[PDB]
Design an enzyme around this catalytic site. Structure first.
Site, short mmCIF file in Angstrom:
data_model
loop_
_atom_site.label_atom_id
_atom_site.label_comp_id
_atom_site.label_asym_id
_atom_site.label_seq_id
_atom_site.Cartn_x
_atom_site.Cartn_y
_atom_site.Cartn_z
N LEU C 86 0.80 -1.23 0.00
CA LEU C 86 0.00 0.00 0.00
C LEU C 86 0.85 1.29 0.00
O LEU C 86 0.46 2.30 0.57
CB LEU C 86 -1.11 -0.03 1.08
CG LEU C 86 -2.21 -1.11 1.01
CD1 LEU C 86 -2.92 -1.13 -0.34
CD2 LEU C 86 -1.73 -2.51 1.34
N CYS C 87 2.01 1.26 -0.65
CA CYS C 87 2.93 2.39 -0.77
C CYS C 87 2.90 2.95 -2.20
O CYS C 87 3.07 2.20 -3.17
CB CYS C 87 4.35 1.97 -0.40
SG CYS C 87 4.42 1.43 1.32
N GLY C 88 2.73 4.26 -2.36
CA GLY C 88 2.63 4.93 -3.66
C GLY C 88 3.95 5.09 -4.43
O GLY C 88 4.25 6.20 -4.87
#
Lengths: 59, 115, 276
Positions: C86-88
């Site tokens: 869940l890291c951009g």
């Protein structure tokens, strides 16, 4: 120590060779190996470009 | 379904099951997108109980032996209430989800789990 | 097709949008908890650097192997990565910078050794074939410096034994809450009064330098955790916004289906009434 200041640069746990060496051996043992890769792969760049462009379509 | 007709213990057990199932329905869609590990400690525990309750509602019928292959079971109201109160109270948090499917009374789930 | 299933899709996406909006605020709270842990580690490392700088200048007779450069063909890297997703783009932009700098050494004929922190880094080297010599994973959101001792020692011994010529740490820098910068930083190749030096000044130096490198690696790991929560905040904000577009498209399809059903029913009522 200084004439107008005192500092104790403490430790969170006792630092000694018998404790210090066990962690290094565990770090060497924890290194999972399944394929002896050459490190000269070009694929890293293709997959990095594929995912970097996908992350731009997401915003 | 009124306390003056069935007593408070049966009424509370029935409403307890409905509350757990209603809460699980709104968590089901989240797990399909983010996974079970992204939920809180309370939600993770509640989802396991909801999936056990959902399976404990199943029952093999004597008229359905031609479809199920397994023998039919008759379960009384007291046995039914005791089984749902135990799953709601956490008396079976250690049993696997598959132990409650097509068994009959609550003791049959305890016996199926060992197999 | 049917107006029943479209309503179910809208409800499914609306339920999801509510929790991604909540996770954004959770990521901010964890980012603030990480920023205070970054600040708490600074007063120790700056004092060790001040002591190292004075001692190395006051005692010219000795130069620890870390303070002198050997121009040979073998290098080491400590790679910091997340355990969770869940890291951009946090790990992707970091690995891109790692590969960019590693290629300079591969092309110059130099060999490379790798140390890995976090499950995403381990998965990258396991799938692409990286020769990892030491690894650690599943550390908490609030890591402890004693967990890093092993991984750092393996990398320091290889430099002391002359196997590694230069050592670098690869991690993200917290520029501001909206910006995480991937960087490769060198480690090993680092008022007119003297101390009393109770034990040997050379012995003190041999000990202080090891604590300095470990404090630099710990600060890099803690700062990477603040960058991870900032990257997660942005990712959950974007996920919340994309769900809003899907709800909007489905609402236009639902309204079109709603109008068609009323028109068909009236056609059937008028058609049946004209035949009777």
């Amino acid at each position: 120590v200084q004439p107008n200041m005192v500092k104790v640069l403490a430790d969170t746990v006792v630092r000694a060779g018998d404790l210090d060496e066990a962690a290094a051996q565990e770090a060497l043992k924890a290194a999972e190996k399944a394929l002896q890769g050459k490190g000269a792969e070009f694929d890293y760049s293709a997959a990095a470009a594929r995912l970097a462009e996908a992350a731009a379509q997401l915003r | 379904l009124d306390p003056l007709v069935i007593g408070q213990d049966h009424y509370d057990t029935a409403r307890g099951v409905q509350y757990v199932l209603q809460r699980y329905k709104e968590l089901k869609d989240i797990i399909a997108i983010l996974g079970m590990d992204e939920l809180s400690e309370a939600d993770k525990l509640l989802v396991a109980r909801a999936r056990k309750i959902q399976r404990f509602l199943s029952q093999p019928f004597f008229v359905a032996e031609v479809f199920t292959g397994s023998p039919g079971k008759y379960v009384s109201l007291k046995d039914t209430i005791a089984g749902f109160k135990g799953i709601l109270n956490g008396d079976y948090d250690h049993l696997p989800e598959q132990a409650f499917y097509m068994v009959g009374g609550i003791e049959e789930a305890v016996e199926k789990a060992k197999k | 097709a049917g107006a029943k299933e479209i309503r179910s899709k809208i409800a499914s996406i609306k339920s999801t949008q509510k929790i991604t909006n909540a996770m954004e605020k959770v990521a901010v709270s964890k980012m603030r908890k990480a920023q205070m842990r970054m600040a708490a580690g600074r007063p120790y490392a700056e004092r060790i650097r001040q002591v190292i700088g004075h001692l190395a200048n006051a005692n010219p007779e000795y130069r620890h192997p870390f303070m002198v450069e050997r121009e040979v063909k073998r290098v080491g890297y400590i790679v910091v990565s997340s355990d969770r997703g869940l890291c951009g783009g946090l790990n992707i932009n970091l690995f891109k910078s790692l590969v960019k700098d590693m290629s300079g050494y591969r092309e110059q004929g130099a060999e490379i050794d790798l140390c890995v922190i976090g499950s995403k880094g381990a998965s990258f080297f396991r799938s692409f074939g990286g020769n990892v010599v030491a690894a650690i994973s599943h550390l908490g959101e609030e890591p402890s410096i004693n967990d890093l001792i092993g991984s750092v020692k393996v990398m320091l011994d290889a430099y002391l034994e002359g196997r590694i010529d230069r050592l670098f740490v690869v991690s993200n820098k917290f520029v501001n809450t909206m910006t995480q910068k991937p960087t490769v930083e060198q480690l090993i190749p680092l008022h007119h009064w003297d101390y009393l030096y109770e034990p040997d000044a050379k012995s003190l130096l041999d000990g202080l330098l090891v604590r300095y490198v470990e404090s630099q690696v710990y600060q890099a790991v803690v700062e990477n955790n603040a960058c991870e929560q900032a990257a997660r905040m942005i990712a959950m904000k974007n996920a919340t916004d994309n769900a809003g577009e899907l709800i909007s498209d489905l609402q236009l399809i639902y309204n079109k289906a709603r109008q068609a059903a009323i028109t068909q029913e009236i056609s059937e009522i008028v058609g049946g009434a004209a035949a009777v």
